[PDB]
Amino acid sequence: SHGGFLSCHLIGQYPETYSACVVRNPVINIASMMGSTDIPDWCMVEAGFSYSSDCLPDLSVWAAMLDKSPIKYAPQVKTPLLLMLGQEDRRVPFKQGMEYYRVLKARNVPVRLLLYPKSTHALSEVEVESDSFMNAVLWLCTHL
Amino acid sequence: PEEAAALYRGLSRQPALSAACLGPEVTTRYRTVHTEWTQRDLERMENIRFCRQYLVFHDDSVVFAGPAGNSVETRGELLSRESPSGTMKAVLRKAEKQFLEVWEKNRKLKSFNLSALEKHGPVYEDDCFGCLSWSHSETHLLYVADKKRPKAESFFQTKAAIKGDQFLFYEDWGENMVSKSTPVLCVLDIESGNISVLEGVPESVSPGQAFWAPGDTGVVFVGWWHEPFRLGIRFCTNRRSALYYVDLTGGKCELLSDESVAVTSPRLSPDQCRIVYLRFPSLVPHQQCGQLCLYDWYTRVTSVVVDIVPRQLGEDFSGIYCSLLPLGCWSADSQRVVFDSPQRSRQDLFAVDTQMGSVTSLTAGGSGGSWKLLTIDRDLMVVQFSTPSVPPSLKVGFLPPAGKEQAVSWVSLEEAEPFPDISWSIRVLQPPQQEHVQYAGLDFEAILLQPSQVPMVVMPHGGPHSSFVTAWMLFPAMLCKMGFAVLLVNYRGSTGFGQDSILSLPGNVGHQDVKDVQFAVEQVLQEEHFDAGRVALMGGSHGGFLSCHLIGQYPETYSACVVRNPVINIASMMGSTDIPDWCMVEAGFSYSSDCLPDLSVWAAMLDKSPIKYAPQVKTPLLLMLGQEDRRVPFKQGMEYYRVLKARNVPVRLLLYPKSTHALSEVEVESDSFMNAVLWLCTHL
Amino acid sequence: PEEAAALYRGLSRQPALSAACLGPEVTTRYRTVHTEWTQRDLERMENIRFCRQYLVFHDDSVVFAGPAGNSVETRGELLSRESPSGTMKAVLRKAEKQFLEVWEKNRKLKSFNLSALEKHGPVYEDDCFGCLSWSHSETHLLYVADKKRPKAESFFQTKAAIKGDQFLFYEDWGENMVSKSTPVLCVLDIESGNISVLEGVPESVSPGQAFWAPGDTGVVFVGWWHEPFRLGIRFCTNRRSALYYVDLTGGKCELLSDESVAVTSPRLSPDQCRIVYLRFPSLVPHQQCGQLCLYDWYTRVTSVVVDIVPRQLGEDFSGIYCSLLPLGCWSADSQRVVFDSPQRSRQDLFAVDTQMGSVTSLTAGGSGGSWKLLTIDRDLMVVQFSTPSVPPSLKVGFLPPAGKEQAVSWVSLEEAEPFPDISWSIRVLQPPQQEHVQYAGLDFEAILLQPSQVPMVVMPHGGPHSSFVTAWMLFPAMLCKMGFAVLLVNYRGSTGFGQDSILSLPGNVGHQDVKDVQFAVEQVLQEEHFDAGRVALMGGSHGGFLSCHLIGQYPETYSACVVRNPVINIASMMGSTDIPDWCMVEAGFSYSSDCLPDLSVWAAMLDKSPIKYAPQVKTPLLLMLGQEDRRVPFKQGMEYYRVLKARNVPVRLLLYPKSTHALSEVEVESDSFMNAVLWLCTHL
Amino acid sequence: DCFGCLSWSHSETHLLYVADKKRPKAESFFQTKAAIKGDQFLFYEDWGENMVSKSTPVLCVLDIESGNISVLEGVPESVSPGQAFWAPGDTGVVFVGWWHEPFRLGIRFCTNRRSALYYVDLTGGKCE
Numbered sequence A: 001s002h003g004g005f006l007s008c009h010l011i012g013q014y015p016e017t018y019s020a021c022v023v024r025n026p027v028i029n030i031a032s033m034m035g036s037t038d039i040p041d042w043c044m045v046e047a048g049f050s051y052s053s054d055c056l057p058d059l060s061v062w063a064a065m066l067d068k069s070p071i072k073y074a075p076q077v078k079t080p081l082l083l084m085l086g087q088e089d090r091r092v093p094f095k096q097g098m099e100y101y102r103v104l105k106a107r108n109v110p111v112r113l114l115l116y117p118k119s120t121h122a123l124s125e126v127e128v129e130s131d132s133f134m135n136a137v138l139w140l141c142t143h144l
Numbered sequence B, C: 001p002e003e004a005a006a007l008y009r010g011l012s013r014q015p016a017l018s019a020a021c022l023g024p025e026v027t028t029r030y031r032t033v034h035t036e037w038t039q040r041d042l043e044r045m046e047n048i049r050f051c052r053q054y055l056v057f058h059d060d061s062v063v064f065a066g067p068a069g070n071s072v073e074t075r076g077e078l079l080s081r082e083s084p085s086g087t088m089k090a091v092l093r094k095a096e097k098q099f100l101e102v103w104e105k106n107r108k109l110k111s112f113n114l115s116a117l118e119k120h121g122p123v124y125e126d127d128c129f130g131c132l133s134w135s136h137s138e139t140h141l142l143y144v145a146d147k148k149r150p151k152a153e154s155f156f157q158t159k160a161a162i163k164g165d166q167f168l169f170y171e172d173w174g175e176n177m178v179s180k181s182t183p184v185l186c187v188l189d190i191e192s193g194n195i196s197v198l199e200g201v202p203e204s205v206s207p208g209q210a211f212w213a214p215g216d217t218g219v220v221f222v223g224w225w226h227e228p229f230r231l232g233i234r235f236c237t238n239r240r241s242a243l244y245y246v247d248l249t250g251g252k253c254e255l256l257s258d259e260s261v262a263v264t265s266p267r268l269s270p271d272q273c274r275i276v277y278l279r280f281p282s283l284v285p286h287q288q289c290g291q292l293c294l295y296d297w298y299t300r301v302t303s304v305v306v307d308i309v310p311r312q313l314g315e316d317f318s319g320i321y322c323s324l325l326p327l328g329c330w331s332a333d334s335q336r337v338v339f340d341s342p343q344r345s346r347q348d349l350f351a352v353d354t355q356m357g358s359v360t361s362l363t364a365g366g367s368g369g370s371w372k373l374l375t376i377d378r379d380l381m382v383v384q385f386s387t388p389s390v391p392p393s394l395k396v397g398f399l400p401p402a403g404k405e406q407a408v409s410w411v412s413l414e415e416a417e418p419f420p421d422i423s424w425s426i427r428v429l430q431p432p433q434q435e436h437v438q439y440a441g442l443d444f445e446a447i448l449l450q451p452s453q454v455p456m457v458v459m460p461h462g463g464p465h466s467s468f469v470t471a472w473m474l475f476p477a478m479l480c481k482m483g484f485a486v487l488l489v490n491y492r493g494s495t496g497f498g499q500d501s502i503l504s505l506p507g508n509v510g511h512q513d514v515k516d517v518q519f520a521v522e523q524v525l526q527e528e529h530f531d532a533g534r535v536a537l538m539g540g541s542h543g544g545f546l547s548c549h550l551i552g553q554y555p556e557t558y559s560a561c562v563v564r565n566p567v568i569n570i571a572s573m574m575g576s577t578d579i580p581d582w583c584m585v586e587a588g589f590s591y592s593s594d595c596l597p598d599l600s601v602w603a604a605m606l607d608k609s610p611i612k613y614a615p616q617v618k619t620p621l622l623l624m625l626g627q628e629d630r631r632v633p634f635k636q637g638m639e640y641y642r643v644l645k646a647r648n649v650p651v652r653l654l655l656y657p658k659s660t661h662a663l664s665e666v667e668v669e670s671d672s673f674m675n676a677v678l679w680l681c682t683h684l
Numbered sequence D: 001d002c003f004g005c006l007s008w009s010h011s012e013t014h015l016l017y018v019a020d021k022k023r024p025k026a027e028s029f030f031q032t033k034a035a036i037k038g039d040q041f042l043f044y045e046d047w048g049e050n051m052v053s054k055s056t057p058v059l060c061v062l063d064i065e066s067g068n069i070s071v072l073e074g075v076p077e078s079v080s081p082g083q084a085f086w087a088p089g090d091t092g093v094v095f096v097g098w099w100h101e102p103f104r105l106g107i108r109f110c111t112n113r114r115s116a117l118y119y120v121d122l123t124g125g126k127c128e
Ligand SMILES: CC(=O)N[C@@H](C)[C@H](C)O
Pocket: A001, A002, A003, A027, A039, A042, A091, A092, A121, D109
C-alpha cells in the first residue's frame, strides 16, 4: 500500500541502491486516484489542501498531485519489480498498478504481475496470502 | 404506466433479420433461400432466434417467389456454414461444452467433442476473429480458438505442472472480449478426426479472419499487432494489422500488404485469382473512410480500385464506411463487387468494377430508406429494406449486366405492415464564425420525426465518428407514438460526409459539435414552430458528453435530460480505459505508447471536460450506468452525480450490476427505456 | 471390443421418423410436407430431434417431389399443432417452466406463462392423455393438465392453507406416469388471455383425448374410471372407459357409448357429421382385437363398421390391433378410413368403408415389409416403409377412388441405403398332443435372419399379447452383422393371428408357449442345418420368463442366456405390481378388486413360476435389472440370481439405478446391448 | 466491529442489536401476475471499503418473553447509529451517530468522520 508508494519513490529516485522490489496494491498516481476511491479527502489532505465537499480542484492542485506522484520518476527505474493486485480493491483501485506496469513494460524492464480476481485491499484470504507470500519469498531468493 | 407498457410490447413484436444464404439450384429452375431472424421475448426476457425457408423460381428473372414452411426456433447454435457445394453443413453447438457437428441430408454424420480432445481453449464466436471456412476439397475445416495455457498448481497441494503460476495475468482485447488473450488457427480433418494447430504465425501477432488459399495449399489471414499493449478493438478500425499467408506444412510465412496501416475484410473471387480488402490510411480517428484495394494472386501486384473521397465524388458517392464486407460480395463474372455504405443521412448499395474503377449506386434516387445486403450468389442478391415508418422487409433481386446496373427490379419475399402515424424528413443545415479555416463550406444534416404545442426530444449520436441513418429505430418510433417530436442530429464529424468532415472534428471536441447541435435545435424550433417551453435532451455515451455540455453551457433552454454511460472527465478517464489513444486524439495530441503526459495536456483535457460547467446546471437529470462497463468506467457518472447532489439538484440514478457499455440485455434495455419514457413524460 | 463399438456406432447413425404433417396448397399447384426425425447421439449421449421440409408438386398425380432445405435441430418442444387453416401454429415449450406460444408467419404473436397464472399443474406430454386441439373458430385452444392441490404447511412454521396435510398420498397411473393423479381439461382464449377449467367432468372419471365438438359448442372426450383403484394404463387396453360430451357453459354432461367396455381413439370426419372409435369387447387380456364403431352426430345412432375376426377374414385381414388411430385418418369424401394394422408376421395398411363395411388392403402382396401411416390430408398419404435389411424410408401417395384402392403408386421422398448382407425369411410352424380341444388348427410363425457352423440366437417377444413384425430392428441386425443367425418367434397368443390365438393363451402360460418355442427351435435346427452345439437365448419381461423356463425345463440345449427385467414368481409379483390383474388372468383366475387370493390361487401361480426349475439351471446367465421398474419389481430377478449363485451357477448382474421396464435411456441402452453381445460371443 | 453490537438489558429480559433497514419491494414493468414498479435497479450507497451492501443501519430490540421485534423511532434521518448500549435503568438507548450527508465517506481505517453521542428513549422517540 502506502509502503508500496514509498518503495516506488525509492527505486525511482535512487536507482543504483537496490536489487529487487515487491509491492502489493501500491499508489502510483494521486490525481487519477482521487476520482475513483471512497476517500477523496485523503488525497487532498496528503497533497496539502483542505478538503471541501462542494468544491472542484483547479489546475494547481492537479499539478501538485502530479509532482508528488512516483510515476514522474518512472523512466529511471532499473530494478526488477513484482506486483500483486486485487481486482476487487476499492480503497486503492487496481488500475494504479497497471499503469505503472505498462510504463515499465514499454521500456523493457523485467516485471512480473499477479492479479487476484476476488481479493481486496488486505489480501487476507488464506490461499491468497499463502500464494503471495510464497511468490515474494521465491522472487527475493532468486534475484538476491 | 399501462399504456406505455402496451405500446412497448406492441412495438417490440416486429422481428429483425440476422443472416441469409442461398441453396443449390434444382432443375424441375428454382432455389431455396434460408433466412434467420431474431426477436425479443418479454415473457421469458430473452432474445429468440429462429429460421425460415423461402422458394424462388427463376427462368435472369424472378418468375415466382413464396414461403416454403413455418418458423422453427433453434437454441445453442453459435457458428454455421453451408458447404461450398451445398451437400453438407458444419455447425458449432454449445450443448457447458462445445461440439462441432457435420450434418448431411437428414442425418448427423459425425460430431466432435472439442473440449475433451484437450488441444486448445474455447472457440471464438465473435465477428472480429470468428471464422469457419470449408476446404476447397471439402475434406477439412478451419476455425480460430484460444491458446492452451499450461496447467498450474498451488504450493500446498495434497497429491496421492508449474507451481505458483496459478494467478498469473493474461491481457484481453478490451471491451466485450473478456478472457480472450491470444487466438490460434486450428484445422480439423473430418475423415481421421485429428486437430492440428498451425505453426507459422508470428509470435507478436494475433491471427483472424482466415480462409483457405486457392488450391488448398495454405491459409490466408489478417494479423493484428499486440506489442507492447493490447488496445481495445471493438468499434475501432485503426489498429495496426497486415495480411499474411502461411503454408500448412513447414511453417513458411509470407507478407502480402503494407505493415504500417490497418487492413481488413479480405475476400476471394469465385475464379480464385484475386483478393479484395479494405485499407485505412490514418490511425488517429477510430472510424474513417477506407480504400478498396485489390491483389492479384498470380501476377503478385496490388492496386487501388477505390480511393478516399475528400468531400463527394458525384451526387451519389461519399466513401466507403463499412467495417466488414459481406461474406459473399463478388459476382459470377468475378469482376464486380457489391457492398453497402452510408451516404449523407441514408444507406445505399453500390457496385464497383475492379478494372475500370467506377462505382454505381443501385438504390440511387427516391425519398430515402436504408438498404442492407445479406448475400449474393450467382448474381442473385438478398436485401433487407427498412425505413423509420416501417419495420424491415426482405427482398430478392437479380444483378443486371455491366452498364445497366441502375435498372434493377425487386421482388418482395416478406413485407411488414407500416405505421402511417409517423412522418420523417431530412433537414440540411449550414453553419454561420463557427467555420474553421482549413475546412470551410461543410454542412451537416438532421432527421426530424413528427406526428402525421408539440414537445421535442433531441438525440445526438455517439462515436463521435458514427452517424444516424433512416432505418427502423425502436425508441424514436415509440417516442413519436407517445407524442414527442424527435430530432436526430448528425453534427460535423459524422460518417457518410467525406474524409474532411471526419478530420475536422479531432482537436475541437467540446466547442464545435455543441454549437452545431444548438444551432440545429434553434433553427428547427424557429422554422417548424414547436413548443419552445418543453424541449428535452437524451444522449448516450459521447452524446451524453454533448448533452452534459449543452445543459451546462445553456441552462435555460432545456427542461430534462437522460444520459446513459456519459463521459465526464477526460483526464480521469485516460488512466482507466482500454483506449487511452481516444482521449489523446480527441484532445488534439498524438498518442505515443512510450510517453507520459505533461501538465499542458492535463490542462487541455480539464478545459474540454463538461465537469467544468457543473456548478451552473439547473435541469433535472437521470443517469443510467453499467457497473461492469470497461470502455467508459462507471465512476465518471458518479462524480457528476456527486457534484450535482452537493448543490441540491434533483438527480435520479440507476446502476445495473452486470450491464455493459451497450446495455443490450433485454431486461436492462426494457427497464431503462421505460424509466426514460416515464421521466420525460412526467417532467415535460 | 473395438469392432463391436464401431459396428454399433455405424448402425445407430440411421434416423427414424416421428411425425408428419401437410401444409396449405399454393397455386403457382404444390404442397409442403413437414417431417420430424429422431436420432441417437453417442458423443452427447442423448436423443436428438430435428425437422425437415419437402415440396411435392401435384397436378391427382405426383408430378414432382424433392427436398426444400436442410435439417434444423429443435430443443425444448413438447407438443405442437398446426392451425386447421394452416395460418398459425401453437407450441408448448419447456424453457423449468412451461410456455404456450402462438407463432404466425415469421413472428411470435404471443406467449403465455402457464405456471405463473397459478390455475393448474404441469401439462400432459404423454400420448394416452396428452392433446392439443385448435377451435373450429380458430380463437380458442384446449389441452389437459394436472389438477391443483391445495397448499399445505407444517405445524411449526415461522410466520411474519391446510396444516398437517403436507405428506398426503396421491395415487398415480402406474408405470411411467409418476405424479399424474387426476387430469383436467383447460381452455385458453387467445384474445383475452384467460384460462378456464371445464366444470362438467364426473368426479370418478379422468378425462383425456379431447377434441372440439362440431360448432364449437362443447368438448367430446374419453373418460377412464379410477374407482376404487388406479390400475396401470401403459401397454394395457382393457381399462373401463366411455365417451362423454360436456358443454362449455352449464356443466351439462352426456354419454355417447356403452359404459361397460373400453372405448378409445375417437376421430371426427371433415364433414363434421360422424365419429369413429375403437371398442374392446373383453377385459381379461391386456391386448386383444377390437372393433371399429361409428356414431352419427345428427341421427344419434351407433353401428359396427368392422367386427372381431375369429381366425381370418380372407387372405389379407386378421383384425384391428392398433391402440391409437392416426391423428388424420378420414378421407376427403368423409366415407373411408385408412389405418395400419399387423397381419401375420408383417404390418399393412387398410382402407375401410363406413357404409358398405368392406376392408381393402392397399399394401397386399409382395415379399414383406412394414408400413406405417403418418397422416392423410386431402387424399394425400404420407407413409414410412421399413424392412429388416433397410432403414426406414419416406413415401408419398395418392388415394385412388373407391373400388380401385389396390392400384396405388408411391413416390420416394427419402430413401436410405440398404444392407445387402442380411437375408430374412418367414417360417410357418404347425404344433403336433400339444393342441388344445377348444382351439385346434392354429399355427404360428418365426422370422429367421441369416448371413447372405453358424450359431443361433433365439428371441421370444414380451407381452405376451404382442408380436414381432418385419421392420428395422437394430439389435437383430447388428447380431446378424456380427455373424449370429437370429430367430424371432411369434408363439401362440401373439397379435395379428385372430382373436382365438389371443384367447387360447390365458390359463396355460408356462406349459404351452415354452413348448412352442422349443418346437420352433428344434424344427429350424433340423431343417436349416445350423450348429446345434452353440445356441443362445435372449428375452425381456414375458420373454425373460419364457427363457428361464426353457433353460430349466431343457437343461442341455443352450450355451448362454441374457435376460432383462424378467418375471420369476407370479405369486410374489401380485402385491408389488401396478397391474395385479395380469397375474390372475394369466394364471387362469378372474381378477376382482374386492378379493383376497386363496391357497389354490397361490399354488397355481407358484407351479407356473420358473423358479420351481431353478435347481436344474446350468447355463451361464447375464441379468440386467432396472432399480425403478414398477411393472416387474426388480426383486424378481434378484431371487433367481440368489438361488443360482448359492448353487454356484455363473451369473453376472448389472443393476441400472434409474432405468425402468424399457431401459430406453441412451446411456443404459448402449451399455446393455454392448455387454450382451460380448457375453454371447465369449460363451458361444 | 464499527457498528456491530449486542447488549443484554439490565433487567435481563431484552436484547438489542443493529441491522440493515428494510427496502420496499420492487417489481418489473412486465411481470406475469396470477410494490413499486420500475425501482428495481435503484442505487443504494454503501460505506466504502469492506462494507459492501451496508447503507443505513437501524437499532432493533427483541423481547425474549413475547418474541416481538421493534425498531426504535427516534434516530435522526441524516445519521447512522451504532455502538449502542442500554442506559442506566433500562429507560433508553445511548449510541454513537455518524453523519452521512451528503456523501458516505469511507470508514475503515479512518477515525476522522463527523460523529456525535445520542440518547433515545424507548417510547416517544425523544432524542437528546
Ligand atoms: C488509507 C489508505 O488509503 N491506505 C492505502 C493507501 C494502504 C492499504 O495503505
